[PDB]
Amino acid sequence: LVEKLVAVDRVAKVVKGGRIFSFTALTVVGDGNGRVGFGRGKAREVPAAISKALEAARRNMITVDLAGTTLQHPVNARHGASRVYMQPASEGTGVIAGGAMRAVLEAAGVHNVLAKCYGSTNAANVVNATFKGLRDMTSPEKVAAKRGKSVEEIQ
């Protein structure tokens, strides 16, 4: 279960005599075969917040059916003001994607994909959108299952 720390920010809160500082971290975990999850942590120091985030990320994991090591079809997804588009590529390309997206793609076992973010590039909302896009992508088996056909009769 390989772990990928995506973002680490320092946030402040006003009190009567000055500022109280703290840290948030956003991390991704996955194995490399179709299971990935993401989480967030908060703490007064950076390693403590990272630990908290990783523990919150080891739940909220999902499973995703994928054609070899690329997507089954093109995916549109969004969370809040962030939009992500993903396309299956053919072997020999890498993950052509930017930052927050890769960690969700690389940690689930995707090796060839064309990906592009529109809208806001907030890392947390981008990771949320990509997660939602992989969670609701379907394979050629569930489609024929729910339609009363076989995998051959459809394509």
Partner: protein, 130 residues
């Protein structure tokens, strides 16, 4: 006034599927019935029944669910009265790489995109269903 009557059928169906209705009933016409039969063959709905009253006919579709989700996930009008589509034969659109159908009107009737690439034709693109 209502001016697209096929988009109205697709909207009635889309709304019923997310209100979890069992059947949906609309006014009927030859093109609506043809499209619903293409939906039935592909396995997206269960049953299609038309019934005439004295002069006007009403059409009743019976929907499908699976794992507590509706079977029609996406249904989209493509060629509206404000912009008609008319693809050729190399340019027929493939919906979700082939895990969905595209309803096409050609001079041999209404069919799906994969069924018209075989015949070597293709006219107006009615809708995408995935």
């Amino acid at each position: 006034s209502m001016q697209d009557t096929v988009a109205d059928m697709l909207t009635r169906v889309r709304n019923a599927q997310m209100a979890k209705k069992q059947t949906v009933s609309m006014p009927s016409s030859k093109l609506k019935v043809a499209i619903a039969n293409v939906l039935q063959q592909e396995g997206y709905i269960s049953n299609v029944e038309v019934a005439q009253e004295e002069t006007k006919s009403t059409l009743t579709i019976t929907l499908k669910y699976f794992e507590g989700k509706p079977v029609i996930e996406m249904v989209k009008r493509v060629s509206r009265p404000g912009l008609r589509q008319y693809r050729g034969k190399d340019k027929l659109p493939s919906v979700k790489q082939g895990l969905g159908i595209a309803i096409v009107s050609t001079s041999k009737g209404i069919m799906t995109d994969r069924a018209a690439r075989a015949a070597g034709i293709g006219g107006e693109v009615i809708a995408f269903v995935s």
